[PDB]
Amino acid sequence: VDPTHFEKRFLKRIRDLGEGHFGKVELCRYDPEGDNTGEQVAVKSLKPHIADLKKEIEILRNLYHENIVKYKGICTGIKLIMEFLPSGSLKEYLPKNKNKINLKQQLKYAVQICKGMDYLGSRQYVHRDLAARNVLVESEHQVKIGDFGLTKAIETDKEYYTVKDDSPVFWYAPECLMQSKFYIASDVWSFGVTLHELLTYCDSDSSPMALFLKMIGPQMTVTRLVNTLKEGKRLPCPPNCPDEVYQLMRKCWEFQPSNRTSFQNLIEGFEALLK
Numbered sequence: 001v002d003p004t005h006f007e008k009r010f011l012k013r014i015r016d017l018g019e020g021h022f023g024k025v026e027l028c029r030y031d032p033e034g035d036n037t038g039e040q041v042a043v044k045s046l047k048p049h050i051a052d053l054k055k056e057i058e059i060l061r062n063l064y065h066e067n068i069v070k071y072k073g074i075c076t077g078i079k080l081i082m083e084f085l086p087s088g089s090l091k092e093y094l095p096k097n098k099n100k101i102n103l104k105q106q107l108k109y110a111v112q113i114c115k116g117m118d119y120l121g122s123r124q125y126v127h128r129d130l131a132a133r134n135v136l137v138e139s140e141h142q143v144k145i146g147d148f149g150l151t152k153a154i155e156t157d158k159e160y161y162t163v164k165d166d167s168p169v170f171w172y173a174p175e176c177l178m179q180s181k182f183y184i185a186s187d188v189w190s191f192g193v194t195l196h197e198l199l200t201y202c203d204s205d206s207s208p209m210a211l212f213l214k215m216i217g218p219q220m221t222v223t224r225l226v227n228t229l230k231e232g233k234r235l236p237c238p239p240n241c242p243d244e245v246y247q248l249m250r251k252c253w254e255f256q257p258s259n260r261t262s263f264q265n266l267i268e269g270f271e272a273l274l275k
Ligand SMILES: COc1cc2ccccc2cc1-c1[nH]ncc1NC(=O)c1cnn2cccnc12
Pocket: 017, 018, 019, 020, 023, 024, 025, 042, 069, 082, 083, 084, 085, 086, 087, 088, 089, 133, 134, 135, 136, 146, 147, 149
């Protein structure tokens, strides 16, 4: 018996967790005993792209880190089976838990995101989609990177991956916008934007999209965004965020990828502030 092979007849749908343009994640119970005692699992599938999901499954199958969502297996068309985290993403959890999550916890979550991300980089992958919606809450003390839908391997001895083919433009570094080039330093830029979200408790009115649209004016959006970044304009300091924290966030946003901070330097910076 292969423990990573989930039989369709025992995989019982409970409800939707979230839906995208091409796929969805559902809460299922794998119940071979048929008495509702089986384990709850998160199941990613496509709407009735297939080749991309198979590449995603093989990426996650080989990633093992305390801050990366656990691969469980497959249901073969194919479905990706993962551990279920009931608290959902930071985007859903943070607005409902402000009283529980203070600055010290936001900085520990920031460290955890950086550790998962530094690990993905050491395995030669560029995430391309780091945003709060992709960071899952295990507990009030732990987060995990929860999706790898856009993840690409960077060729040995190369610095970036060029993407051929709906992009999260308000989280994208200037090289991603202008040349479709994705470096490890591009994920650091996206991390800076995710840190801004975490510090605002994912407030929709001060989302990266809302804030950049106010700067540029509410097919032409991306050109105005690139121009705004070339002028040196950046997302403002979050309310109640100390300047020393905002300075670390600003180091994620150096125009040139080679001038940006590393995830290791960010971890060191946050750990210095936590003392
Ligand atoms: C990362 O979340 C999504 C990714 C998607 C990727 C593609 C399409 C839809 C997606 C929806 C979600 C999502 N939206 N609202 C909550 C959640 N996910 C969880 O609540 C969740 C709970 N354990 N779990 C394990 C793996 C993945 N997701 C989860």
